[PDB]
Design an enzyme around this catalytic site. Structure first.
Site, PDB file in Angstrom:
ATOM      1  N   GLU A   1      25.844  41.928  54.553  1.00  0.00           N
ATOM      2  CA  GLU A   1      26.139  41.007  54.274  1.00  0.00           C
ATOM      3  C   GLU A   1      26.011  39.689  55.368  1.00  0.00           C
ATOM      4  O   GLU A   1      25.141  38.008  54.720  1.00  0.00           O
ATOM      5  CB  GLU A   1      27.372  40.501  53.242  1.00  0.00           C
TER       6      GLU A   1
ATOM      7  N   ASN B   1      21.899  29.574  48.383  1.00  0.00           N
ATOM      8  CA  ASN B   1      21.618  30.645  46.950  1.00  0.00           C
ATOM      9  C   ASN B   1      20.313  29.094  46.472  1.00  0.00           C
ATOM     10  O   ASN B   1      20.366  27.252  46.832  1.00  0.00           O
ATOM     11  CB  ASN B   1      22.264  30.795  46.138  1.00  0.00           C
TER      12      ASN B   1
ATOM     13  N   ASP C   1      19.965  28.476  43.341  1.00  0.00           N
ATOM     14  CA  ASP C   1      21.048  27.339  42.443  1.00  0.00           C
ATOM     15  C   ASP C   1      21.583  26.764  42.562  1.00  0.00           C
ATOM     16  O   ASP C   1      22.308  25.453  42.224  1.00  0.00           O
ATOM     17  CB  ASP C   1      21.100  28.403  41.244  1.00  0.00           C
TER      18      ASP C   1
ATOM     19  N   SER D   1      24.333  27.024  45.169  1.00  0.00           N
ATOM     20  CA  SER D   1      25.136  27.046  45.198  1.00  0.00           C
ATOM     21  C   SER D   1      25.363  27.607  47.267  1.00  0.00           C
ATOM     22  O   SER D   1      23.873  27.945  47.546  1.00  0.00           O
ATOM     23  CB  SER D   1      25.654  28.276  44.706  1.00  0.00           C
TER      24      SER D   1
ATOM     25  N   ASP E   1      26.572  31.287  49.612  1.00  0.00           N
ATOM     26  CA  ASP E   1      27.499  32.451  50.455  1.00  0.00           C
ATOM     27  C   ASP E   1      28.082  32.346  51.400  1.00  0.00           C
ATOM     28  O   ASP E   1      27.452  31.882  52.577  1.00  0.00           O
ATOM     29  CB  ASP E   1      26.374  33.887  50.185  1.00  0.00           C
TER      30      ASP E   1
ATOM     31  N   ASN F   1      30.458  33.960  47.384  1.00  0.00           N
ATOM     32  CA  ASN F   1      29.339  32.683  46.218  1.00  0.00           C
ATOM     33  C   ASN F   1      29.822  31.609  45.826  1.00  0.00           C
ATOM     34  O   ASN F   1      30.775  31.710  44.532  1.00  0.00           O
ATOM     35  CB  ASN F   1      28.518  33.608  45.701  1.00  0.00           C
TER      36      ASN F   1
ATOM     37  N   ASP G   1      36.671  42.315  38.858  1.00  0.00           N
ATOM     38  CA  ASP G   1      36.866  41.579  37.989  1.00  0.00           C
ATOM     39  C   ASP G   1      35.812  42.142  36.591  1.00  0.00           C
ATOM     40  O   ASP G   1      35.709  41.650  35.422  1.00  0.00           O
ATOM     41  CB  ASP G   1      35.907  40.775  38.521  1.00  0.00           C
TER      42      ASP G   1
HETATM   43 NA    NA Z   1      26.530  25.103  48.522  1.00  0.00          NA
HETATM   44 NA    NA Z   2      28.319  37.708  46.581  1.00  0.00          NA
END
Ligand code: NA
Ligand code: NA
Ligand code: NA
EC number: 3.2.1.17
Length: 129
Positions: free
Chosen positions: A35, A46, A48, A50, A52, A59, A101
């Site tokens: 990662e 990302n 969209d 967002s 990370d 995220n 989750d």
């Molecule tokens: Na962002």
């Molecule tokens: Na992630």
């Protein structure tokens, strides 16, 4: 801070990630390697909108507030910058919530694609734990 592999294994173990939700320590070390390259300061946008954050690339779409992901959630109830500290506590505590989750470590694309199904215990080989 960029951790060494065994350095991070020891820190993650002390913070309670070994066997957390059944994921042995090597899973977490492998996930962090792929990662973030073990780098607490890693950030990646990302498509969209967002971003990370941190050693486990958590995220802003769901888990932290970065001030620039409008309409997103903040399930870990933290600023995303808390995930960049040399102290990995906030990243570990948020990761514990994520992995609990329902989807397990599949939340981490690099874990799915580069750790899941491999000999992940290799990631703690040679380390004094
Ligand atoms: Na962002
Ligand atoms: Na992630
Ligand atoms: Na957010």
């Amino acid at each position: 801070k960029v951790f060494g592999r065994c350095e991070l294994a020891a820190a993650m173990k002390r913070h309670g990630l070994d066997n957390y939700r059944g994921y042995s320590l090597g899973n977490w070390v492998c996930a962090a390697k792929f990662e973030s390259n073990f780098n607490t300061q890693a950030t990646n946008r990302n498509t969209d909108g967002s971003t990370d954050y941190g050693i486990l690339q958590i995220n802003s779409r769901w888990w932290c507030n970065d001030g620039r992901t409008p309409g997103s959630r903040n399930l870990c109830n933290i600023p995303c910058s808390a995930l960049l500290s040399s102290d990995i506590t906030a990243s570990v505590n948020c990761a514990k919530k994520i992995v609990s989750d329902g989807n397990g470590m599949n939340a981490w694309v690099a874990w799915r694609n580069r750790c899941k199904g491999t000999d992940v215990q290799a990631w703690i080989r040679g380390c004094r734990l």
